[PDB]
Amino acid sequence: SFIKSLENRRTIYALGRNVQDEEKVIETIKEAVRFSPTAFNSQTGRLLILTGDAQDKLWDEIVAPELKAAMEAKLDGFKAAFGTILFFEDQAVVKNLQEQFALYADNFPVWSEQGSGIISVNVWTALAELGLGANLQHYNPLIDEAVAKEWNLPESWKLRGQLVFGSIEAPAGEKTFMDDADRFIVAK
Amino acid sequence: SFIKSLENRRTIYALGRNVQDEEKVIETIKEAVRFSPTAFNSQTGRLLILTGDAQDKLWDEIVAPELKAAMEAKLDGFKAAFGTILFFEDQAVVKNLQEQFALYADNFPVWSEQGSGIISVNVWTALAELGLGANLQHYNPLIDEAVAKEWNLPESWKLRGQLVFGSIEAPAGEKTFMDDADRFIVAK
Numbered sequence: 025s026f027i028k029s030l031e032n033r034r035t036i037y038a039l040g041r042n043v044q045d046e047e048k049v050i051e052t053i054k055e056a057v058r059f060s061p062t063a064f065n066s067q068t069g070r071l072l073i074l075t076g077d078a079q080d081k082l083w084d085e086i087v088a089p090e091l092k093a094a095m096e097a098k099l100d101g102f103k104a105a106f107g108t109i110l111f112f113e114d115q116a117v118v119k120n121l122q123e124q125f126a127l128y129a130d131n132f133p134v135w136s137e138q139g140s141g142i143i144s145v146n147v148w149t150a151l152a153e154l155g156l157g158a159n160l161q162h163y164n165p166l167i168d169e170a171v172a173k174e175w176n177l178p179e180s181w182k183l184r185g186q187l188v189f190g191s192i193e194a195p196a197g198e199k200t201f202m203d204d205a206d207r208f209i210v211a212k
Numbered sequence: 213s214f215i216k217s218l219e220n221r222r223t224i225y226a227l228g229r230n231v232q233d234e235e236k237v238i239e240t241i242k243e244a245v246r247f248s249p250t251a252f253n254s255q256t257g258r259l260l261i262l263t264g265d266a267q268d269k270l271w272d273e274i275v276a277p278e279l280k281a282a283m284e285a286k287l288d289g290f291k292a293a294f295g296t297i298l299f300f301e302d303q304a305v306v307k308n309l310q311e312q313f314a315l316y317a318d319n320f321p322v323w324s325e326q327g328s329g330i331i332s333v334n335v336w337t338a339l340a341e342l343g344l345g346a347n348l349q350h351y352n353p354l355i356d357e358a359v360a361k362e363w364n365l366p367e368s369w370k371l372r373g374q375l376v377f378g379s380i381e382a383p384a385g386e387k388t389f390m391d392d393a394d395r396f397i398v399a400k
C-alpha cells in the first residue's frame with residue numbers, strides 16, 4: 025500500500041548505525057531519485073551520500089565549526105547516524121533551460137525547488153520502507169563551500185537539504201493534522 | 213514495494229472518465245496530502261478537486277478563454293479527463309511563520325514551494341496505484357483569479373499546479389535517465 029508507505033515515513037531524531045545492508049540502502053536511494061518526476065525530465069537533482077568516516081567529517085569538521093564560527097559572530101545526534109544524504113540542484117541545467125525556453129525562464133527555478141522536495145521525500149520514504157529512520161536538516165547555505173571543497177563538487181550544485189539517516193533508536197513523536205475542511209474543497 | 217509504486221507513476225496525456233469509485237479516489241487524494249511532510253508541520257498545501265460539471269467549466273469557461281485572450285495579445289484532451297486537482301499554497305500561513313520565526317523568514321517560501329512539489333507527486337503516485345493516470349500542468353498565474361472567483365477561494369491560496377487525472381486511455385511514452393555517475397556521489 026502506497027498510502028501506508030507514506031504514513032510509515034516519519035521524522036526520527038534518534039538514529040544509530042545498526043544498518044544491515046549498506047549496498048541495498050544505496051541502491052534504494054538511487055532508485056527513489058531515478059523514478060521521481062522533474063519538469064521537462066530535466067533531472068536537476070544531485071546527491072552526495074556520506075557514510076562512515078565521511079559522515080563523521082561532515083558533522084565534526086564542517087557543520088560544527090561553521091555553526092560555532094557563525095554563532096560567535098548538540099549536533100552529536102546527527103553524527104551518531106549512519107549517514108547523511110546531501111541534496112543539491114544543478115544550476116547549470118536550470119540556467120540552460122532558461123536559455124533554451126526563455127518563455128518559461130521564471131518557472132524552472134520554481135520547478136527545480138519543487139523537484140528538490142520531491143526527491144528528498146521519495147528517498148526519505150524509501151528508506152523508511154527499509155526500516156530506517158531519517159530527518160531533514162537545513163544547514164545550507166552556511167556549510168555549502170566547505171562541503172563543495174571537501175568532496176570536490178561542481179560549483180553549479182546548489183545545496184538544498186541534508187537528510188540524516190540510520191537505524192531507528194527511538195520512535196517518532198506525536199503529530200497533529202489540520203481539519204480536512206480547511207484544506208480540501210471538492211466540487212462536482 | 214514503494215520503489216515499484218514510484219515507477220508506476222507516469223505522465224499520462226490520454227485520459228478518460230472510466231473511473232469506478234470516485235469516493236475512494238477522493239479519500240486517497242486526501243490521505244496522500246495528509247501524510248506528506250511539511251516544514252514545521254505547517255501543512256501549507258490547499259486543494260481544489262474538480263470533477264463532472266466543474267471539470268468542464270474549468271477548461272471550457274476559464275482556461276480556454278484566458279489562453280485565447282492572452283495569446284491574441286487543443287485543451288480538449290485535458291477536459292476529457294475525469295477531473296483536475298488544483299494545488300495551492302496558503303500564503304497566510306507562510307507569512308505568519310515568517311513573522312513568528314523571523315530568523316527563517318527566507319526559508320518558509322522555499323520550503324512551501326518544496327511542499328507543493330511533495331504533495332503534488334504523492335497524490336499523483338497514489339492515483340497511479342489506483343490504476344488512474346495523470347499529468348501535471350501549469351496555467352498559473354494566468355487562470356488564478358478566475359478560479360478563485362468561480363469557487364470562492366481565499367485570496368491567500370496561491371495556485372501552483374493543476375494535476376489532471378482520469379482513466380488511462382493510452383500508455384506513457386518513452387523516458388530516458390541520466391548516467392548515475394553524473395548525479396550520485398557516494399563517499400565512505
Ligand SMILES: Cc1cc2nc3c(=O)[nH]c(=O)nc-3n(C[C@H](O)[C@H](O)[C@H](O)COP(=O)(O)O)c2cc1C
Binds near residue numbers: 033034
Ligand atoms: C521542506 C521541508 C523542510 C523541513 N525542515 C526541517 C528542518 O530544517 N529541521 C528539522 O528538524 N525538520 C524539518 N522538517 C521536518 C518537518 O518538521 C516534519 O516532516 C513535519 O513536522 C512532519 O513530521 P514527520 O516528518 O514525522 O511526518 C522539514 C520537512 C519538510 C517537508
Ligand SMILES: Cc1cc2nc3c(=O)[nH]c(=O)nc-3n(C[C@H](O)[C@H](O)[C@H](O)COP(=O)(O)O)c2cc1C
Binds near residue numbers: 136138139224348349
Ligand atoms: C515540478 C514539475 C513540473 C512539471 N511541469 C509540467 C508542465 O507544465 N506540463 C506538462 O505537460 N508536464 C509537466 N511535468 C511533467 C514532467 O515533464 C514529467 O514528469 C517528466 O518528463 C518525467 O516523465 P514522467 O512524469 O512520465 O515520469 C512537470 C513535472 C514536475 C515534477
Ligand SMILES: O=[N+]([O-])c1ccc(O)cc1
Binds near residue numbers: 063
Ligand atoms: O508545454 N509546456 O508548457 C510544458 C511541457 C512539459 C513540461 O515539463 C513543462 C512545460
Ligand SMILES: O=[N+]([O-])c1ccc(O)cc1
Binds near residue numbers: 250251252253
Ligand atoms: O530548528 N530548526 O531549524 C527547524 C526545526 C524544524 C523545522 O521544521 C524547521 C527548522
